[PDB]
Amino acid sequence: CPRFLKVKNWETEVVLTDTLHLKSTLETGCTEYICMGSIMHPDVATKDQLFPLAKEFIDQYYSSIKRFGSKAHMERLEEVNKEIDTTSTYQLKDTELIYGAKHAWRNASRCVGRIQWSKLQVFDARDCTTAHGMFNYICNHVKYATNKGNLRSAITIFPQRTDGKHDFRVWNSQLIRYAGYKQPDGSTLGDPANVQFTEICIQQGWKPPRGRFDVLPLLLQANGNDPELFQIPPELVLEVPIRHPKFEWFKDLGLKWYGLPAVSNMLLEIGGLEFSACPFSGWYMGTEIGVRDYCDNSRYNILEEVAKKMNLDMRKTSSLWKDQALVEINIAVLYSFQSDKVTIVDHHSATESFIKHMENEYRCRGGCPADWVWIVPPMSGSITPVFHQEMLNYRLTPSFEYQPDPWNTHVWK
């Protein structure tokens, strides 16, 4: 592989040089003959697999703190090595855990919000042993991150995988989601994306309100045991009613959303150690809600209804009635969050910040892995600066990875 790869920005002519790609640790899915750049998704580590992975990570940590080759570096290497030999695994120091989490984010090629990577509150929950304990840790996470609307990015890290039969998992794909209910007539109530998970909760004992915006309970698995249900205290769930600055009728749509985006189904990989339960949260970019959650056809799908109230000609697509309603819906989402003083960022500000971040990373780090297909917002793409920005995509470690859904793998006791 070449040492220096160049990316160009076509709007500004700015050319950047990437050397960091050389540290790439896993597969993209692409080959020389085929590109899988738009493919969404393209029993434990042995002693011998673990050694080099740990050393790689420890070396990187001590390099970051300007102590590479130091006595403490060599000592930590030797202590880690001894531990893998005696126990087949090892434990990260708090400093290393914190470093690894921040770097997993920094390395997340699909995230446009990475300018904030070094400000991340890490909660060490590796002493957790039960589902009730997971509940307590998650509630504290939610409260801290929510911060009455002045959101703060955070991650809570539960115990690493051991033999694979004692995994900690948050079964919820996200900490806060709204229920979806399939009706006998084929229609769906609530969020159609969440029908399967909702059914699981119901089966596990949940009493469903059967509303349009019912916050789902937490379904929590500790130490490989069967998962348990807990209801997040409603006062910990900050919500924003959606209204529009011009259209007084917009509030009559009965829309709202939750303030806190918190992914809970991913796996955090640090130095070959696997943290299967590591819920992390930041704050929303407007389009996430205004374009995808609200306007995807398989989601709340409100374009028609909004178009109707806007008195739009909806007979020809070439009227762009869909596009027109989309913009207004996204204005309403930003207006409502700002008015309730809940942190949110529009797609213009976020993408501009990301370009600045990316340039800084090329400068200090020799590159910045980025997935253009995900970085470019789902509306108004080319009027954001990321559209014109060539990106290189590659996988650095530590990283957040996908993992199978726990109800597909769980061995019920």
Ligand X SMILES: CNCCCc1cc(F)cc(CCc2cc(C)cc(N)n2)c1
Which parts of this chain interact with its own copies (CB under 8 A)?
1, 5, 7-8, 10-12, 21, 24-40, 286, 291-292, 295-298, 303, 317-320, 322-324, 326-327, 330-331, 334-335, 338, 346, 348-349, 371-373, 376-383, 387-395
Assess whether the previous peptide bond of 398 is cis (omega < 30° from 0).
Answer: yes
Pairing, β 180-182 against β 5-8: unpaired
- Which range binds ligand HEM by CB under 6 A, 23-31, 104-112, 231-239, 312-320? 104-112
Q: Which is nearer to Zn ion, 24 or 81 (by Cβ)?
A: 24
Interface characters, 392-411, with ligand HEM (x: CB under 6 A): --------x-----------
Residues 360-399 close enough to bind ligand H4B by CB under 6 A = 373-374, 387-390
User: Helices marked H in 65-128 — which ranges?
Assistant: 71-87, 94-106
Q: How many residues interact with ligand HEM (rule CB under 6 A)?
A: 20
Residue 114: active-site member: yes
The values of phi and psi at residue 273, to 5°, are -85, 145
Q: 274: which strand partners?
A: 269
Minimum Å gap between C-beta 301 and ligand X is: 15
Long-range contacts of 301-305 (CB under 8 A, 24+ apart): 302/253, 302/255, 302/329, 303/329, 305/253
Largest CA distance in the chain: 74
**Partner whose binding site includes residue 295, from its own copies, ligand X, Zn ion, none (CB under 5 to 8 Å by kind):** its own copies
Q: Which of 100, 282, 286, 369 binds ligand HEM (CB under 6 A)?
A: 282
Does the annotation list 60 as a binding residue?
A: no
Q: Which of 62, 123, 280, 337 binds ligand HEM (CB under 6 A)?
A: 280
Distance, in Å, from the CA atom of 397 to the CA atom of 98, rounded to the nearest integer, reads 14
Please identify which residue in the block is written with the tokens 């819906």. Answer: 329
Q: Which is nearer to ligand HEM, 98 or 314 (by Cβ)?
A: 98
Residue 390: active-site member: no
**Partner whose binding site includes residue 373, from its own copies, ligand X, ligand HEM, none (CB under 5 to 8 Å by kind):** its own copies
What sign for the dihedral angle of Cα 403, 406, 411, 413? Answer: positive
What SS3 state is found at 270? strand
Pairing, β 5-8 against β 15-18: antiparallel
Distance, in Å, from the CA atom of 82 to the CA atom of 103, rounded to the nearest integer, reads 25
Query: Do residues 131 and 220 make contact, with C-beta atoms less than 8 angstroms apart?
Result: yes
Does the annotation list 269 as a binding residue?
A: no
Using the rule CB under 6 A, is 105 a contact of ligand HEM?
Answer: yes
Q: 218: which strand partners?
A: 230
Q: Which of 117, 171, 257, 283 is catalytic?
A: 283
What SS3 state is found at 29? coil
Distance, in Å, from the CA atom of 368 to the CA atom of 354, rounded to the nearest integer, reads 10
Distance, in Å, from the CA atom of 361 to the CA atom of 365, rounded to the nearest integer, reads 5
Q: Which of 96, 228, 274, 288 is catalytic?
A: 288
**Partner whose binding site includes residue 374, from its own copies, ligand H4B, ligand X, none (CB under 5 to 8 Å by kind):** ligand H4B
Q: Which of 96, 105, 111, 328 is catalytic?
A: 111
By the criterion CB under 6 A, which residues form the site for ligand X?
A: 113, 174, 177, 261, 263, 280-285, 288
Using the rule CB under 6 A, is 28 a contact of ligand H4B?
Answer: no
Residues in the annotated binding site for L-arginine? 174, 283-284, 288
Catalytic residues: 111, 114, 283, 288
Please report, in range form, the residues annotated as the binding site: 38, 111, 174, 283-284, 288, 373-374, 387, 402
Residues near Zn ion (CB under 5 A) are: 30, 35, 37
